[PDB]
Each structure stands twice: as structure tokens, then as C-alpha cells.
């Protein structure tokens, strides 16, 4: 009649991805955790652009969208910054946004590659991932001799539910029950399917025997970060975000019970 006692075991941790295993937890909890990893982890992404000059072959909406998809370092600042909607300021301020600026002109005869390295931010903590000192710089647009591109962007705090640019993951490999013991899938020819990397079976075997008393446990994860948040910070922010969502829901629930009590 109470909660379970989940455990965790990290099998790999790098700057790009984190591979871990959660045990003694429900499939609903593990799936919600994955959904938070994908849609409800706030990060900093350009969400406001003012094109002061754009003579390139790509129209303004194209440049805006392309800047929006550029990931920005959001490791420790995203927890400090608030949502522009909740901020009580005027258009912007350092508490709710990060100013960026771009001013490039192709004076030489060679094509000028406007890259993420040209995005100058007012805050040194929020910079393009390629700009954090390997990987090359993201390409915003190529310019021809005589063309110019000058704009002024502002980054905001958001999560995946608002737009995919605020999704900090580049893939969340969620898996459970590598050996089909629970038979949640039914392979018509189990011998034709390959073995999961987390599978523990001899090559002569195809799938584990059926377990009537089995329940989904030991969920395997591989959270590849896009660069904005460290792979482990994505998980911590996801757990904290889901706990905050449940806490606010509990507040509204209690306010509704006492409404009738």
C-alpha cells in the first residue's frame, strides 16, 4: 500500500551520454521518466530573433528557425533563470533571457560560413555547445561576397513540450526485459530476432522461458545529450521536474479537497 524502493546502477557516464539501469520500479514510472527526459527538462534555446539585415539567400524565417535549433549551454544557469512568461520585467532582462548578437559580412571572395562561433552572448555561461571548449561549429548560413547578415537573438528557458529545440536529449534508448520473459512481445520466429545488448542468454537460446509471476523491472536507459545539459544533469533535472509537477499537483489537490471540506 506504499511506494517501492528503487535502485540505480550507472554502467557508463561520459560527456555525450549516460547509460544506467533502474531496478525495483514500475514501468509507468520508468516511462514517465523517459518522457520527462524528452519533453520536460528545461534548457536555454534561442526563442526570439530580430533580423536587422539579411542579404543571404535564406529568408528570415529560415535563419530564425536555424538559430532556434542551435543548442546553448544550460548546465547550471537554467535553474537560476525563470520563464519569460513568469518574469515581471519588460521585454527581457538577465534574469529571464540571454542576449545573443550576430553581425557578419562577406567582404572576401571566398564563401563566408556563418557558424555558431559568430553568436556572441552577453552571458559567458550560456554559449553554443560547439563553442564550449573535437566537434566543429554548427553552420547557420553561407554568405557570398557582398552579402550581410545582422541580427539580435534572445534565448529563453523552455522544455520539449513547447518546441523540439528545448529537447536536451539526442535519443533516449529505453529498454526493459531484454530476454522476452514477460512475453510482452510475441516473436513469431524468436530465432530470427537479434539479441539485445543487455540480454543474458546463450546463443543457442532465443528467448527466456515465460514468467507468469513476472513484472517489468530492471529498466535500461541510454540518455544521449545534445550538448545543452550534461547527460547526468538531464536525469537529475528530469527527476526534480517530475517531483515538482507532482508537488504542485498535490497542492492543487489539497486546495480542492479543502474547498469541499
Amino acid at each position: 500500500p506504499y511506494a517501492n524502493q528503487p535502485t540505480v546502477r550507472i554502467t557508463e557516464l561520459t560527456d555525450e551520454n549516460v547509460k544506467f539501469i533502474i531496478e525495483n520500479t514500475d514501468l509507468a514510472v520508468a516511462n514517465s521518466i523517459r518522457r520527462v527526459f524528452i519533453a520536460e527538462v528545461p534548457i536555454i534555446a534561442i526563442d526570439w530573433v530580430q533580423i536587422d539585415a539579411n542579404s543571404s539567400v535564406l529568408h528570415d524565417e529560415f535563419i530564425a528557425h536555424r538559430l532556434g535549433l542551435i543548442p546553448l549551454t544550460s548546465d547550471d544557469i537554467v535553474d537560476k533563470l525563470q520563464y519569460s512568461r513568469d518574469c515581471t520585467c519588460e521585454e527581457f532582462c538577465p534574469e529571464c533571457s540571454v542576449e545573443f548578437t550576430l553581425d557578419v559580412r562577406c567582404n572576401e571572395d571566398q564563401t563566408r560560413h556563418v557558424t555558431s562561433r559568430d553568436l556572441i552572448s552577453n552571458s559567458p555561461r550560456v554559449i553554443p555547445v560547439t563553442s564550449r571548449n573535437e566537434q566543429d561549429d554548427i553552420l547557420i548560413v553561407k554568405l557570398r561576397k557582398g552579402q550581410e547578415l545582422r541580427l539580435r537573438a534572445y534565448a529563453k528557458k523552455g522544455f520539449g513540450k513547447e518546441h523540439a529545440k528545448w529537447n536536451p536529449t539526442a535519443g533516449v534508448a529505453f529498454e526493459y526485459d531484454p530476454d522476452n520473459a514477460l512475453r510482452h512481445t510475441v516473436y513469431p520466429k524468436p530465432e530470427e530476432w537479434p539479441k539485445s545488448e543487455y540480454s543474458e542468454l546463450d546463443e543457442d537460446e532465443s528467448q527466456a522461458p515465460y514468467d507468469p509471476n513476472g513484472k517489468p523491472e530492471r529498466f535500461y536507459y541510454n540518455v544521449e545529450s545534445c550538448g545543452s545539459l550534461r547527460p547526468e544533469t538531464i536525469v537529475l533535472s528530469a527527476l526534480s521536474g517530475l517531483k515538482k509537477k507532482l508537488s504542485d499537483l498535490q497542492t492543487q489537490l489539497s486546495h480542492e479537497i479543502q474547498s469541499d471540506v
Partner: protein, 67 residues
Amino acid sequence: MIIPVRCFTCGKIVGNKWEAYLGLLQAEYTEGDALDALGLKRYCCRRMLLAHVDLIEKLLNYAPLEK
């Protein structure tokens, strides 16, 4: 037109991989070895780099509107 920034499917950054991919092709790499060297394991990201047509380089051959 220009190489996208994220992979449409997963979201992996690919915008910074186009130039490296071309440099590898000129470096006598196969498209598969190049996509592996760039760290593109999912076939969705491999689709992004392998099916791209860089038209921007041809749009830059036309004189601009302003000099």
C-alpha cells in the same frame, strides 16, 4: 538546401557534421566509414547526412541583390 541543424528524428546535432563529412569523402573515406567516424550510429542521423543535397553552394553562385 543547407544541412539541417538537428536530426529530424532523434535531435542529434548534424549541422556541424557536413563539412567534416565532405572532408572525409575527399579524404578517401566511404560514406559508411565517414558516418561512423563522425559518430552517427542511428540510421536516422545517417539518413540526415547521407541524403542531404547542399544546394546553398549553388545558390551562392548567383550575384546578390546588394553589393
